[PDB]
Each structure stands twice: as C-alpha cells, then as structure tokens.
Amino acid sequence: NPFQFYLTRVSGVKPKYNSGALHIKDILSPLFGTLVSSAQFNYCFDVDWLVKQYPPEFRKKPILLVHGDKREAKAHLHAQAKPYENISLCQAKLDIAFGTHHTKMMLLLYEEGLRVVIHTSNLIHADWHQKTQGIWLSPLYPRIADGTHKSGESPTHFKADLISYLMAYNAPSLKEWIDVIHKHDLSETNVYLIGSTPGRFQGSQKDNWGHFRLKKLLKDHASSMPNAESWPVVGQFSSVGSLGADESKWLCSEFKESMLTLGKESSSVPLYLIYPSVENVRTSLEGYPAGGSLPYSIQTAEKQNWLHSYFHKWSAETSGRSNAMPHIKTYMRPSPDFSKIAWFLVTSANLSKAAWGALEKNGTQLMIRSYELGVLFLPSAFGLDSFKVKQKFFAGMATFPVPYDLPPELYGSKDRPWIWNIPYVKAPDTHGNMWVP
Template sequence: MRLLCPFWVNKIDALSIDSPSALTLRDLLCTNVDDQNEVWSYVLLANFLFDMEWLFSVAPSLLQTKKKLFLVSGEKGLAQQFSSSSFSGAIDKGRIRFIEPKLPLPFGVHHTKLAICVNENGIRVAIFTANFIESDWSQKTQGIYVQDFPKRSNIDKVTEESYIPLNIQDNRGNRFKNELRRYLNSYNVFSSLSDENGIPNTLFDEFDFSNASVELISSVPGYHRGSDAYLFGMGRIESLLESLYMGTSDKSETPLLTWQFSSQGRLTDAFLVKMESAMVSEIKNKDISEQFRPMVQVVYPTESEVRDSLEGWIGGLSLPLRLACCHPYINKRLYRWGFSAKDMNDNKITRKQSVPHIKSYMRLTEKKDALKWVILTSANLSRAAWGEWQKKGTQLAIRSYELGVFYDSESFIQISDELFSVTPSRPIPLPSSVEGDGLIEVRIKKKEKKGSQDEPILFLPYDPLNPEPYASTLQLQKSEGSEDKSPLIAKDRPWVIDIPHFGKDALGKDFHEALKTNNSIDHTVDEISSLEKKAKMENKNNRSLDL
C-alpha cells in the first residue's frame, strides 16, 4: 500500500479534472445537520480575511453549531461585518464569539489560517493557506492539511482536577496536541468547564491524537527569550530539526533548500543567514562555512505568469511584493512557478495558470530525487512572520501570528480498515493524482535505510526538484565573482506589484483596466479594500505587505 501524506490542494473552478487531492472549503466545514453526531459542537475559524456572506453560503451548517462558534481575525469590524450580513439572524448571538488577538509589537498581523471543528465523533484540525474569500479557494493555488481524530475510548470523564496542561510523554500525537493547545492559548480561548464563553480547557484530552502525522510550527507575536525562543518561528524550526534529525546529516554535501512564498518583507542579510541556519540545524557542526552554506531555490512567479494566469493582472494583488522589498540574495536565486508560453499555446487550462498563494519550505536530498522534509505554512518570507534574533541571539522578536505543519518520512496517514472521519456523510478523500490534475508526485526520503517500508508521497502543485531558473538567475550565478556588468536579461522578471505593468492579460485587460473592473472577476470588495488600506499603511510606515 502506498504511504500518503495528509496534503491536499484546493479545487480550481476552471479545471474540469476532479482530483481526490483537491478540496473545497465546503469539504472541510460542511456536515449532515440531520445527524446530531455530525453537527458541530465547537468550531474555531481563524484567518486574515473573512467574507462573511460567502463563508456562510458555502458552509451554512456552521450556523447550526451547538455550543460556540469562534471567529478569530485581526480585521477590524468583523463583528459588524457579520451583523450586517444576511446570516446574522440565523444563529443566536450567545453562540458566536469574535476574537481579535493581541498584537503587542508594531506592524504585526493575524495571518494564521485554521479550522478546528468538534462534534460527537471527534475533532477535525485543518491548517491551510487560503483566506476565507471566494477567489482564494476557487482561483488561486493553496495548500491544505487536514486530519480527523476520534474520541478516546474507555476513558474516565476528564475533570478540571485531573487536567494536566501538558502531557510529558514525547510522541508525535502528544506533541501535536500540546503545540496546538499552546498556540490557541495565545487567543485566550480556553476557559473553565463552568464558563460557556470559551473552549473547555479539558476538551482536547477527550480525543485520541495518536495518529497525528505532522508536527506544528507556529508564530506568536512577542519577545521570546531563553528556551521559549525555540517554541515559535524560526526557533521552532531549529529545535524541531535538531530533535528529529540530529546526527543523520553530514557536512560533506551542500544542503539544498526550496523556499516558495507569495510575498516577502524587508529582508536583512542577518535574517537570511539565520533562516538558512535554522533549516540545516541538524548538521552537527552548525558553524557552516561559506563553502557549505545551503543552496536555496526561491520559487516565485514571473510577471508573465501573473499576466497569463486565470485571473490575469488581478491575481497579482495576492502577491504584494514591493520594489523596496526586493533583495539581491533573492534576485539571484529565483525560479519560475512553472507556467510557460508553451502552456498557453496548448489552449488547455492547467493548474499552473492558478496564481500561487501557497507557502512551502523544504529540504531536498543531495541527489535532488526526493525531499527530506516539507513545511506548509501561512508564513511568507519575512522577519514579522518567522522572527528576528535580538540581544546577541537570546531573544526572538515575532510580530505576526502564523501557523504551519511539518512533514517528514513519518508523516503518512495511518489506515487500518478504513480512514476515520468525523463526518461519515462527507469523508475527506484520500489524496491521489489523476491524469491532467497538474500535480507532481514527490517522495519524502526515509531518514535511515532500514527495512523495506515505502516512502511517503505528496502531490504538490509545482515541481521543487526540477524548477526552471529565471534567465536572470542563470546570468547572475554565472557572473558571480567576475567583473561582468552586463545588463540583466529582462525575459523573466519577478512579479512586483508597484512597478508599471504593460500589455493585455489573459482576460484581455491592461493593468489599470483590470483594477477598475476587479469586482467582475470574483474579488470581493472587502479583499480589495483591505489590500488598499494595507498598501497605504505600508507607504506611510515604509514597511512590507505580508498577506
């Protein structure tokens, strides 16, 4: 039997291929409301952007939540947006709670994309890269992790007296539960059993997380010092790799990394070096010489890939990289998302034409024939998201909320007779690839060559093993160390939102015409308004957008 990682993409409306690896938001949130065991008791939805009308039209069963529906967002006026929606009267106000997480450091945002749904059957945890807006789910490329966990069997009723905040047993299931609880604590969402305004702090102990396939990597804003600095952001990556991989890598081969994101902040050399170091922290001697610094491939779409995408120029609004944030380190490591003129000439819509909003970071094998590990996350490449080391490396400053999952060779779905589902009427399908779905099958290599166990596979929306470099990337790499000052080849240039864009897009519009008619191609007014407000804020504070 093939070992499958719990990794899915979103279903693109324009694609006619129905792939088991492509999910809709309805797949994650909908239940059979006639089955009381399926109806949600608690739901927590966290995101950066919400379109209330669309969200509840897609998943009306959310309004049947028995005890509490939590909506977590950094957006101002979320409660008012809901009260003015057509669904505001469909749920008792006592059963819905709006949470605006604290942002203790300037310029931070709540960027996590998360759904936790509890019913009588168990708990569903979904972590993804899409906002709760229609175009994110129907037109862009996203990544999705989701797993269902059953209720523990034959356990005594958990009481507050018997509740232990952190289980000290060191296995993946307990780590998953504890990391999730640690992250949710930052929302101040847990409460005593007698307080109906929160999630009971004993609730997670009712579920069996033993089949958790992934590790969690979160970012919580604040100044994290001492050992706490290794619980979040890039500190968490470093400590996780050290604990899982220490001693399995040597320094004889140059480490290979792929970074893929939809935006980047104002980067510094020190930050980039620390990100590199965190992702190779399992190497015994971490004092990596220049000769053995990782080789990094940055996968990011070109201007032509945005122009020729399903959304045309408008798709670039979700890639808000600004000229002031471009960095030489990134410029000479750029690789295309994967859509080319040849694809256009085939006159066939492919997944490659969907602008990437997914964020993924991974370590490749030295032979570039498989992956060592993968991180799927909401976090773009920025100091706000991953943190910045301060005070001689003793303090990690993080500005934003982020959440992601870590896949390795143990990250496969455990299947006995059948896959457990908290929604038997609508189970999540096992991921697989079908002809024409545009997904690439990639293996995660086992840490040690023992036994004959198969290696788990993911179906990714791009090829991290054989990306196509920008023409300028090849030119910069070839001229490195020489005095060649030739003008850069402009054939491939990265999408940068605040420079002039010329020509007609795939929808026959020029850039300014596309901006004026954005509502006609499924972008909500709320999304555009939020982007414009953030753009103004950035210009005022000279900082980067990080959506």
C-alpha cells in the same frame, strides 16, 4: 495516504487535476462529521460567503471567527457578522507593531470527535477559486471517555503544542477550545506543529516559535546525511518582507542557518526561492488580479534587488497548476537531484522576519510580530529516512506529494518578480486587461 496533504480545487483545470483536491464545501460536509461547533482562524473573511459553505443543516451551529483586525477594520468585520446570531468573534492581540494574524486553521467539533484543519486560504471566494492552496487534514480524533485518564498525546507532541499555541492568545473563547482539545485523543497525529505568535522570546522560550522552532525540530528529529551541504533548501511563498540590505543581514545568516539544520552535530548549500514572475501572473487563470494576493510592494523590493537573483518561476505541471497562482507557502529540503526530500513544511508563513522571527539583544531574544501556523512532515515520524518525491501529484504510498515542479527554474533575464503596486501595460492578461493600481 499517510500524509493527508491536499490542494484546493481549481476551477478550469481538467477533472484529473481536481480528483484528489478539496473544496471548503467538501471539508465542512456531513461526510467529515456531524458538526456541533467550529472555530475559523484566518486573516480575511467574507462572512456571507463563509456561512454558505457550511451545509444548510449546520449553518446555525456556533462559529468563532479568530482575527487580528483593529479599529475600522474590526468594526467592518463585526458588521459582517451581526446578521448571524450564532457567530462570535475573537480579536487576537497584536501588541507589536506591523504584526498580523495570518494563521489559517479550522477547529471542527463533531458529535463523533474533533478535527483540526491547517491550511493556507483566506475565507473569501477568490482564495478557493483558481489559486494553488494547501490543506492538512487531521484524523478524526475520538473523545476520551469521561473518567478515563490518558494523555491523548502523539509522538510528535502535537496535542500539547496545539494547546500551547492557543494559550498564547490569552483569550476566553479559545480557553473553551483548549478544554475541548484536552478531552480528545490526538495520539494518531504524525505531523509536528510549527507556530509563530507575537512576542519577544528568550531562554527556553526561544525554541517555541518561528524559525527557532523549526531548527529545534530538525536538530532533534532529523539526521544529517553525508554531503548534506549539497542538499538544497527550497522556499516558496506569496509575499516577501524587508530582509535587509544584503543576504547576510537575515536571509543567509539566521533564516537559512535554521533551515539547513539536520541532527545534533555542530555555507554553500544552494537556496532556491520560488515566487511568481510578472509573466506567471499575466498568463494565469485569474490574470493580473491574481497579483492582488501577491503583495510584494515596490517600496520593499527596491531596497533588496540582491534578493531577486534567488528567484525561480512558479511551475506546477505535476499538479496541473502552473496557471493557478500560489497562495500556499512551503519549505523543504530536497536531495541534490530532487528525487528525495529530508522534510516538508506547509505553512501560512511568508518570507518575512515578521512571520519567522528576527534575533534581537545580541542574539539572545527572538522577536516575532505575527501569528502563523504550519505543519512539518519529517521522515522519522513515518518510520523513514527520507521521503521519495511523487512524480505526478495526483497519480498512483510512502512518496510525498510535492505540488510544484522540481528542479525549480531560474528567472530568465527578462523576467521580473511580481510587484503589486506598479503598473503593467505592455501586454494584456488572460482576460484582456492591463494592471493599473
């Protein structure tokens, strides 16, 4: 396949639903390359578990953990890593309040070249066990011969864009990885990088990050079609931030406006938001504990009940994953009959202003609180006008593997969004338990 978009392995589904899936042990296997050094960008780490996922012969190679933890949380992570002399740490600066380092990425340096993995899972056992998670695997990038002068750049500008993302950290350990990337040929890359970094961006820099980055790419590299107003927008996520008192504050005013963009020319577009209901979580493989990774709080939700009329259940019969709660985040633009898509994005970014950015200073400044990273699949990057939706995710090449069912199904009148910090004691989960936070 040209897309190299994978799901993680799920324990408990039939083998046909894991045949083309990837576990972290598969990614780090010697079959993918002879490891020299790696960087693990993430939010949550179980270091003992993480080292065990590397092949035994590679467990003493240098590992850099890129994280956002501060104060006692930072101390706890350093304590986890101190037993392993080969592990270094890089604290990403979070100078804007309420920001987090959400980016999930592996940089894998081999004797044979370099690989980049952009994915959605925390580095803990539970995130790779029974969740729906997404992975994009780069090609093996060869080294540019010493003395040869070439860009190693792709038509999607991925090399420059990845270096720009890393430069924003202003960190010495990542300057080393920038120099590694400079030395490799990334020209085969067919995806666009969409990142968020913390800051306040005006002028030219506004288009570098967050939903303005997405808008710029859709303006420049997608085409509008007739009846574009009938092509819905779908967003699918594992948490929701505070979006404001009504849809005009952010969701349908600047966020949807960026997501609607197609082509260079100057709204009733349907918006489908996919987020697990309480019943989805209760009947899941993990049961109610799956809701520990769906951190929508009652404090946030009670100020925006307007939002929940947009919500659709999690359903993923196409990939056998209806009971594997989603920690993947995806956004896409299907046709009115959901048979084609104009683009597809897999990312760490949830439905929040912190992740995507919010306009400030009379619309002239985009403020982002967090680090996020995803990759955008555009038909033009594959010589196509649109992608045909693959009917069965794992079945039998230019059709895009959408991991959940279309059309999405609206919540029923008795359904409620999963809210993690209130109790559920009416009906027990698949393990026999209630939920009492």
